[PDB]
Amino acid sequence: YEDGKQYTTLEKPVAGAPQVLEFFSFFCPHAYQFEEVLHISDNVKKKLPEGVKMTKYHVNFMGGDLGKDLTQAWAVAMALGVEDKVTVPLFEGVQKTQTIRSASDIRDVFINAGIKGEEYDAAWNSFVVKSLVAQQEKAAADVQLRGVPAMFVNGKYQLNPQGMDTSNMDVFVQQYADTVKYLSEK
């Protein structure tokens, strides 16, 4: 494992932080890059068993006001538990068909995903969401988020991809996957 290589350790723990935290933006990386980060993100879970939950927050430091809307829209997603239904259409919407330009178009993605309009409007104006939006930004600050994608464990560690199983990707994934495990059981 040797810290400094695959996982760094923060000069200062974050207390009260999720067992596993991922940070992402609907604005970067682009295309296949976003879709493979997604795969990796997914496998870390088919291997992080027994009570260890994964959390994923959006970061607004990319996108401006459409970015602050997306961070709010992601809070609605987590509230409604529709993360796996709106991720790709949101991703493809903002980036691929470049159709999402306003907070309204975001709404169109949820509705076109099966979520009722009033359910969505009720969450977007709901409190739970306002508290998730603040909860997301805090986390970004607490770890002094620099950029994405990023993953932290127990609030102690910052996973570290680029000093690890280079070539391939499957080989990459099992290590990024194996690393997160330890830190949990650590």
**Is 2 exposed, middle or buried (CB count within 10 Å of its CB: 0-12, 13-18, 19+)?**
exposed
CB closer to ligand CCCCCCCCCCCC, 41 vs 135:
41
CB closer to ligand CCCCCCCCCCCC, 28 vs 40:
40
CB closer to ligand CCCCCCCCCCCC, 28 vs 37:
37
Question: CA 128, CA 83: separation in Å to the nearest integer?
Answer: 16
The distance of closest approach from Cβ of residue 116 to ligand CCCCCCCCCCCC in the complex, given in angstroms and rounded to an integer, is 31
The distance of closest approach from Cβ of residue 47 to ligand CCCCCCCCCCCC in the complex, given in angstroms and rounded to an integer, is 12
Per-residue DSSP letter, 93: I
**Phi, psi dihedrals of residue 144, rounded to the nearest 5°:** 55, 50
CB closer to ligand CCCCCCCCCCCC, 110 vs 176:
176
CB closer to ligand CCCCCCCCCCCC, 10 vs 37:
37
**Is 75 exposed, middle or buried (CB count within 10 Å of its CB: 0-12, 13-18, 19+)?**
buried
Q: Is the peptide bond before 29 cis (omega within 30 degrees of 0)?
A: yes
The distance of closest approach from Cβ of residue 15 to ligand CCCCCCCCCCCC in the complex, given in angstroms and rounded to an integer, is 23
Binding residues for ligand CCCCCCCCCCCC, rule: CB under 6 A, are 22, 37, 40-41, 44, 149, 151, 161, 172
Structure tokens at 129: 């969401």
